[PDB]
């Protein structure tokens, strides 16, 4: 059977996910002196992890139930620490930077992954990879900088990128040495992340503040629920795509989805962007695609 349904499903789910994230994190709550801002990134990530874990459990218990998970629990916990940290830092960065900036920054995983591989794994890559990474760096420099300095948002984005690179390294290691399945990956990572986040929010006292804030603006509850549902559906479709087409197709689909998400964020939410900055993003995405093509 022809299977373009993977592309359509992933694209729609993650496009709506990006729109919802823009609406939530950078939304306007209240007017005048009563105006507030969304500072509860931990709770958002906690809800997302809970929904992802539920969906992964459903998928495992219905689909491909004959597998046995050989991964050690401590490996799952260690990877989940970095995964949760990356997601929380990326979500919190939106408190300072525009959403297109956050998407573009978080789309540069290859740079940190290659740096970790070279410095820690002492791996080697073909000349194409270095040239592709060169294009990404040039595009980011052209976008993130202008002739006319780094604040908290850029530092948060850098930390999130580093944690994403660490998470990728750990996932690759344990997939190679334990044959970890994607569904088990999702389920265990999200379970550990939700446990840690629940502990953190409960002992930080942020849960009560979030509850009061939601009471003030009840509309946010529906947005958060839809955000979690879209994330989970996109995760399931990503799993199905990798099963039916491998990781290369998934990477290409995610890259094009990210580009369209940036375009939609600029068009709809009236985010200002100079024509020179457009060259930066197009160069970054071209480099990402070429890197995907040339391994």
């Amino acid at each position, epitope marked *: 059977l022809r299977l373009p349904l993977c592309f359509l499903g992933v694209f729609v789910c993650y496009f709506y996910y990006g729109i919802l994230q823009e609406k939530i994190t950078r939304g306007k709550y209240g007017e005048g002196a009563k105006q507030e801002t969304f500072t509860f990134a931990l709770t958002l990530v906690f809800i997302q992890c809970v929904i992802n874990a539920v969906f992964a459990k459903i998928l495992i218990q219905f689909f491909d139930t*004959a597998r*046995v998970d*050989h991964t050690r629990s401590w490996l799952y916990a260690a990877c989940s620490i970095s995964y949760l940290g990356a997601m929380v830092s990326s979500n919190s960065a939106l408190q300072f930077v525009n959403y297109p900036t956050q998407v573009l920054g978080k789309s540069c995983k290859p740079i940190p992954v290659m740096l970790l591989g070279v410095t820690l794994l002492k791996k080697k890559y073909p000349l194409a990879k270095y040239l592709c990474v060169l294009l990404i760096v040039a595009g980011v420099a052209l976008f993130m900088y202008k002739p006319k300095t780094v604040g908290y948002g850029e530092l948060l984005l850098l930390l999130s990128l580093t944690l994403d690179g660490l998470t990728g390294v750990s996932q*690759d290691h344990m*997939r*190679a*040495h*334990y*044959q970890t399945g994607s569904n088990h990956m999702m389920l265990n990572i999200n379970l550990w992340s939700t446990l840690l986040l629940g502990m953190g929010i409960l002992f930080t006292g942020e849960l009560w503040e979030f509850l009061s804030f939601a009471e003030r603006y009840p509309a946010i509850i529906y947005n958060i629920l839809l955000f979690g549902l879209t994330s989970a559906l996109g995760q399931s479709f990503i799993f199905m795509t990798v099963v039916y087409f491998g990781p290369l197709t998934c990477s290409i689909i995610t890259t094009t989805r990210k580009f369209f998400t940036i375009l939609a964020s600029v068009i709809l939410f009236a985010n200002p962007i100079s024509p020179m900055q457009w060259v930066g993003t197009v160069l970054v995405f071209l480099g990402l695609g070429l890197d995907a093509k040339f391994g």
Partner: single-chain antibody, 235 residues
Framework: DIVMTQSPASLTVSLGQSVTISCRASENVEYYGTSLMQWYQQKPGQPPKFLIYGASNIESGVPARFSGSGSGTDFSLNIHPVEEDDIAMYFCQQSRKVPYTFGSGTKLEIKGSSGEVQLQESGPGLVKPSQSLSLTCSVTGYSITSDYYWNWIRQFPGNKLEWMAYIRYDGTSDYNPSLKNRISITRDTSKNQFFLKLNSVATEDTATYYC?????????????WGQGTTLTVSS
């Protein structure tokens, strides 16, 4: 299921020569850059000795003489200097799919001729066809609820190894699909034993049954083996 073929059935070698043993698989056994292959050595009358996990990595304590290679569907084991110590049968087994399979085995011969575990099998020796049989493996020096996989393996006459089932320390168990309808594996943590039950045994079940401990890393590795128990089914 995957079928492993070893081309040289028997090799005649002189001491100090370099010998390469090939092993070909019916399907690709790579997974995210890792070749899920293992190599074992079995002296006559002894349980197999675990040598290599993955295509290349060498188990700690094995001499530097042994060295694996190959990728995809074709693999080979190389012993550059060969001494009288390492003249034995060599088996290659994949771990890509749930039914773990072993190669037919290659025989070498001289031309011109707290971590320690004690596995112990027990059970009836002579049985009649269609009877119900139960094999007990007693573990001492380690707790079966602590870690590692506890498997049951049998070797038919002709040295054809066959993995049967295992029960993990969690209690999760996996079975050979060809035998899932005939056998059941259980454990008794109080006495530190795990049993295997065979119902309606046939003459084809005559073999030597081993209970072996294993750990998963680049595949399942049966590092520790019991001495094995001989089961004979005769009308």
């Amino acid at each position: 299921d995957i079928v492993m073929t070893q081309s040289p059935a028997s090799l005649t070698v002189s001491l100090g020569q370099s010998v390469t043993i090939s092993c070909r698989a019916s399907e690709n056994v790579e997974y995210y850059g890792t070749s899920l292959m293992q190599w074992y050595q079995q002296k006559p009358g002894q349980p197999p000795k675990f040598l290599i996990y993955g295509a290349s990595n060498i188990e700690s304590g094995v001499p530097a003489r042994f060295s694996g290679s190959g990728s995809g569907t074709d693999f080979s084991l190389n012993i550059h200097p060969v001494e009288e110590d390492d003249i034995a049968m060599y088996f290659c087994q994949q771990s890509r799919k749930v039914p773990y399979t072993f190669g037919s085995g290659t025989k070498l011969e001289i031309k011109g001729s707290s971590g320690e575990v004690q596995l112990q099998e027990s059970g009836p020796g002579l049985v009649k066809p269609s009877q119900s049989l139960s094999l007990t493996c007693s573990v001492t020096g380690y707790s079966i609820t602590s870690d590692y996989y506890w498997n049951w393996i049998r070797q038919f006459p002709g040295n054809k190894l066959e993995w049967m089932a295992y029960i993990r320390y969690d209690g999760t168990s996996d079975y050979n699909p060809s035998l899932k309808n005939r056998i059941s594996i259980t454990r008794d943590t109080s006495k530190n034993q795990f049993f295997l039950k065979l119902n309606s045994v046939a003459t084809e079940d005559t073999a030597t049954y081993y209970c072996a401990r294993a750990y998963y890393y680049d595949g399942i590795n049966f590092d520790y083996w019991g001495q094995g128990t001989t089961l004979t089914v005769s009308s």
